[PDB]
Design an enzyme around this catalytic site. Structure first.
Site, short mmCIF file in Angstrom:
data_model
loop_
_atom_site.label_atom_id
_atom_site.label_comp_id
_atom_site.label_asym_id
_atom_site.label_seq_id
_atom_site.Cartn_x
_atom_site.Cartn_y
_atom_site.Cartn_z
N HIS A 1 -1.45 8.75 11.25
CA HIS A 1 -0.86 7.93 10.20
C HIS A 1 -1.37 8.37 8.85
CE1 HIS A 1 -0.30 3.66 8.35
NE2 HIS A 1 0.62 4.52 7.94
N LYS B 1 0.77 -1.25 0.00
CA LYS B 1 0.00 0.00 0.00
C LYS B 1 0.80 1.31 0.00
CE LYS B 1 -0.38 -0.14 5.04
NZ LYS B 1 0.01 1.19 5.63
N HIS B 2 2.11 1.24 0.21
CA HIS B 2 2.91 2.46 0.24
C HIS B 2 3.55 2.89 -1.08
CE1 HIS B 2 3.02 1.41 4.67
NE2 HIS B 2 2.72 2.69 4.75
N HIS C 1 -4.49 3.61 1.57
CA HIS C 1 -3.58 3.79 2.69
C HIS C 1 -4.33 4.64 3.70
CE1 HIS C 1 -0.46 5.68 5.19
NE2 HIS C 1 0.36 4.68 4.89
N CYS D 1 5.54 8.30 4.17
CA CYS D 1 4.45 8.00 5.09
C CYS D 1 5.00 8.52 6.40
CB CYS D 1 4.20 6.49 5.14
SG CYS D 1 3.12 6.01 6.52
FE LIG Z 1 1.95 4.00 6.27
#
Ligand SMILES: [Fe+3]
Ligand SMILES: [Fe+3]
Ligand SMILES: [Fe+3]
Ligand SMILES: [Fe+3]
Lengths: 124, 124, 124, 124
Positions: free
Chosen positions: C47, C15-16, C41, C111
């Protein structure tokens, strides 16, 4: 891999490698990063250092943290032409980090015509 | 007008107004800007100062120049939860400006939950 | 080396990873970059994806150019607590690049708790 | 006050005014901001639009939220001189905002030699 575009060693004649220095004062870590300490890198409308970013990977951890980013936005441009404003932002970055951890500090630098540059130091 | 969202005066209990200090050394102007000099502003995962920007309008000119921008990007967040990283970037910005001009310096600050804040000082 | 902190992988499984898509219209190249195309995400106060940067290394050249940077700055924070504002900036970036050159496009994603992520595609 | 350095006007007559357009799709608000829609703005090494920022002040609230920031970083510079790279980032910004609120959207634009420009529209 983007790493194929990042350089870590200067060629003779122009300094691009960010130099990292820090002082630990209690839980405060004062970090100074600059390009062209000895021999200044040019700072003109057509050729200049755009920004410096600082990252920190704490000892034994898996994820790096971006600590800060400094943008140098004035490079002499004016309605009277390039290099006429007499306003220039020098590529010197200062960051005050609050942490008791140790680890690795990484600096990332970008010259508008010479790509990305990196350096790292151990935070003890 | 966006100015309707920018504040220039703190309420009692929390400091948001960027404080600008500078020292002129030859053609070099060293500018320090910080939020919460006396009483620190919180720096947590849910409430923190995001960045400080510095602008300069030279005396007698019509267009302001953005001198620099500093982003404070670490506020304790980690895979272990909010406020657990022990890594915090304090809202202290330093800028080294090269100019012989005089004019007005403006600082713009942003708290993630308290909007925009401004301050200005005369550069002599 | 900073590359030791940057991760890559399959965007259909991780997902990143920034997913890069582009359309060439004359001399205009419309680039869309997004995180969480397959697996969304999280976007919460504690987050979230902070930004996406796009770089371009033209075919046969030695220096990469940063094409643009997009910062996603709202993640639900408010005076009423984390995740209470109902204002979230999704990690979807669009860039309109003017060039007739071909080469490699690199995307860099961050992230707030999961470090740096990269991806690249060939610009035809 | 910094507002004394920010200009506004008709985008059909002044090439610097950011033009804001948006489409609401469920809880998703797709915002497009652009400088030079009517009258193209130059994009050269010595004169170009540096970035576009979007803010949102929800109806009835007291604090504005920065929604996003887009930096246009390539303006033709190369080791071969100004305007020789054939790589230019156009001043067109896209933001995907997730919110059910209504309010005011503000855009802030910066030309490297023509200062700050603003515009605003009502989000229904
Ligand atoms: Fe993350
Ligand atoms: Fe250089
Ligand atoms: Fe605050
Ligand atoms: Fe202009």
């Amino acid at each position: 891999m983007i790493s194929e575009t990042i350089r870590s060693g200067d060629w003779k004649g122009e300094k691009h490698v960010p130099v990292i220095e820090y002082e630990r004062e209690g839980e405060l870590v004062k970090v100074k990063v600059q390009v062209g300490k000895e021999i200044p890198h040019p700072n003109t409308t057509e050729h200049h250092i755009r920004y410096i970013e600082l990252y920190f990977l704490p000892e034994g951890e898996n994820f790096v943290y971006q600590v800060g980013r400094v943008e140098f936005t004035a490079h002499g441009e004016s309605v009277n032409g390039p290099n006429t404003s007499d306003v220039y932002t020098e590529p010197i970055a200062y960051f005050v980090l609050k942490t008791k951890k140790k680890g690795k500090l990484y600096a990332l630098s970008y010259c508008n015509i010479h790509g990305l540059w990196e350096n790292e130091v151990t935070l003890e």
